[PDB]
């Protein structure tokens, strides 16, 4: 009974802070939401997912920070073990968040405030927020060998573009992240580097509204000729490690 009451007060504060949209409380309140939604009921958990959804929509209509914060909270909530098992029975789908991330990578590439900054959500840097987003999507802690190859390839190519047009420390961050994804998946993505494995079943559509709509296997990664001559020696070393793993695949 006492636990129930304390959840009542805590989560009342959480949602009324959310509706107040206090900019400096978002990280902590979202951390609390993520770490107590597993004790909150299932129907209220789905209500939390759609609350995250329409907060992301309101941010769509600072803003990047809020969007990435709600995104990382959504992934953390659904990567909780209980919610992981609840999945299908509870009808919990991340497709909207995946599409939002895929469609916002470009703005995250071209915005300036990327690097003006034990916690899992309340992270002060949009770079590390995006890193958590991409780790959750590309390497979810469960069913690592079940990730859709189309999503894998589309995110890989968009991440390479981000690397070309992102500050240097973020650049090395995504270079290492793609090192990780090629280490884990490999054969699933190697067609994006080999041209004679390129699919000829359409033309790559850059400005797609959905990941499957973007046909990723009809184009190949050409970003090496830019990343090998990027000014940062650490970025160059990360790249050469990338092609080393690609060749040693």
């Amino acid at each position: 009974r006492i636990q129930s009451e304390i959840l009542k007060m805590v989560f009342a504060t959480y949602f009324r802070i959310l509706k107040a949209r206090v900019p400096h409380l978002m990280g902590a309140v979202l951390e609390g939401l993520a770490k107590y939604a597993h004790l909150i009921n299932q129907d209220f958990f789905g209500d939390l997912l759609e609350a995250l959804k329409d907060l992301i929509r309101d941010t769509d209509r600072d803003t990047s920070r809020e969007s990435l914060l709600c995104t990382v909270t959504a992934f953390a909530l659904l990567e909780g073990q209980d919610a992981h098992n609840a999945r299908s029975d509870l009808h919990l789908d991340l497709s909207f968040f995946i599409t939002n991330l895929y469609r916002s990578l470009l703005s995250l590439s071209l915005n300036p405030d990327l690097e003006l900054g034990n916690n899992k959500i309340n992270l002060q840097t949009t770079t590390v927020l995006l890193l958590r987003c991409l780790t959750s999507v590309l390497l979810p802690p469960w069913n690592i060998r079940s990730v859709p190859p189309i999503r894998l390839a589309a995110f890989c190519k968009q991440l390479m573009t981000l690397a070309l047009q992102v500050p240097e420390k973020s650049s090395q961050a995504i270079l290492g992240l793609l090192q990780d994804v090629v280490h884990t998946h490999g054969r699933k993505v190697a067609a994006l580097w080999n041209t004679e494995e390129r699919k000829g079943d359409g033309t790559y559509k850059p400005l797609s509204e959905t990941v499957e709509g973007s046909n990723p296997f009809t184009t190949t990664i050409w970003e090496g000729e830019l990343l090998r001559k990027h000014y940062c020696p650490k970025v160059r070393e990360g790249l050469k490690a990338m092609e080393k793993e690609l060749r040693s695949i």
């Binding site: 703005s107 300036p112 047009q165 190949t220």
Partner: protein
């Protein structure tokens, strides 16, 4: 005796540098003689000439911009002749620039952004940028990274509408360095925040003043806050620098993967301007630049569609377009048209002011 005579001689030569054009030539020739003849004497000479150039950019630039440029490209091949000891002095000098930037960032209390943003720091970054650009195409080559580090720090110290022109100038310097070397410097970001400024977004203010010259500005007049003239001026600067950047990298294999982000960002800005600001000149210029970007992306895609990029062999890759030259591309055509137009406008205003002075006399 020997060292003292040498140091007073070079002090006299540095005073001659501080002084007109005939004196420039003579003092530079003497400096050339000194550096060619010369180890310890050579490092002393280059050090003293370094503070000499520092003072020469410490004084001012309203008309002596010619003198500062000539001083710079004259000073460059001194360090070109010296290399190693010059490399060590460049290391320590970039270190002292970095420590100035760092302690200002730390104790940004009061006017740290002021003792950073000046003429001395700007012209110093320009000096090493042009030296490395002229003399890297070795041991001085692996020093660009700290230079880019401090330059980007100077970019993101405080990017306000008052401080637009300084980052325009240092992006010019960075583009010069990128043209000389084969190093990629992301500056489309900074140009896109200049685009995503509130100054050009808000409607302009009707006024009548003189178009400011982006060759002597480190501040902006308080009158130039919402002026349509200043709106337009930053407009052609954004257009021009974007043009140089994208024509600088207009022949690499991965252009479409490198430009579409910027292309769609500028599309979004053009829609936001035409759903705000009313500047049809800027709107048309940015749009037509958008069509050039679409065309060159199509061109490079078509010329790339049939090449092999195997992970164990990049032969057509390492021989992709070595027999192509930077005016064959649509950006090449546009940028040569733009240098012709820009230069004829430069002549227009330069003569205009000359005959104005003659009429006043």
């Amino acid at each position: 005796s020997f060292r003292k005579l040498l140091k007073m001689l070079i002090k006299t030569v540095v005073a001659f540098w501080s002084q007109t054009d005939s004196t420039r030539i003579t003092a530079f020739l003497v400096i050339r003689r000194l550096v060619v003849i010369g180890k310890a004497v050579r490092e002393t000479v280059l050090k003293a000439s370094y503070q000499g150039l520092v003072q020469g950019c410490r004084v001012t630039n309203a008309n002596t911009l010619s003198g500062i440029n000539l001083m710079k490209n004259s000073a460059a091949e001194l360090w070109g002749l010296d290399q190693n000891l010059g490399y060590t002095t460049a290391f320590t000098s970039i270190r002292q620039l970095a420590i100035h930037l760092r302690n200002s960032i730390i104790n940004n209390k009061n006017q740290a952004y002021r003792n950073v943003y000046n003429w001395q720091y700007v012209h110093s970054l320009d000096f090493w940028s042009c030296v490395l650009s002229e003399h890297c195409s070795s041991p001085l080559r692996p020093l660009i990274y700290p230079l880019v580090q401090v330059t980007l720090g100077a970019m993101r110290l405080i990017p306000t509408a008052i401080y637009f022109p300084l980052r325009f100038h240092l992006i010019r310097s960075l583009l010069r360095l990128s043209r000389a070397t084969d190093t990629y410097i992301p500056l489309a970001s900074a140009l896109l925040e200049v685009l995503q400024s509130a100054e050009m977004k808000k409607p302009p203010k009707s006024s009548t003043l003189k178009p400011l010259d982006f060759a002597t500005a480190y501040k902006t007049p308080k009158s130039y806050l919402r002026t349509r003239v200043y709106q337009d001026g930053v407009g052609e600067q954004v257009v021009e620098l974007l043009s140089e950047f994208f024509v600088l990298w207009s022949r690499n294999i991965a252009f479409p993967e490198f430009a579409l982000p910027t292309i769609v960002a500028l599309k979004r800005w053009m829609k936001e301007m035409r759903k705000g600001n009313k500047n049809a000149k800027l709107g048309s210029s940015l749009v037509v630049l958008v069509q050039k970007l679409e065309m060159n992306a199509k061109f490079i895609e078509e010329r790339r569609a049939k090449v092999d990029f195997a992970p164990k062999d990049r032969a057509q890759v390492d021989a992709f377009l070595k027999d192509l030259e930077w005016e064959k591309t649509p950006l090449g055509a546009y940028v040569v048209a733009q240098r012709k137009l820009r230069e004829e406008r430069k002549r227009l205003m330069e003569e205009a002011r000359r005959e104005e002075e003659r009429k006043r006399r």
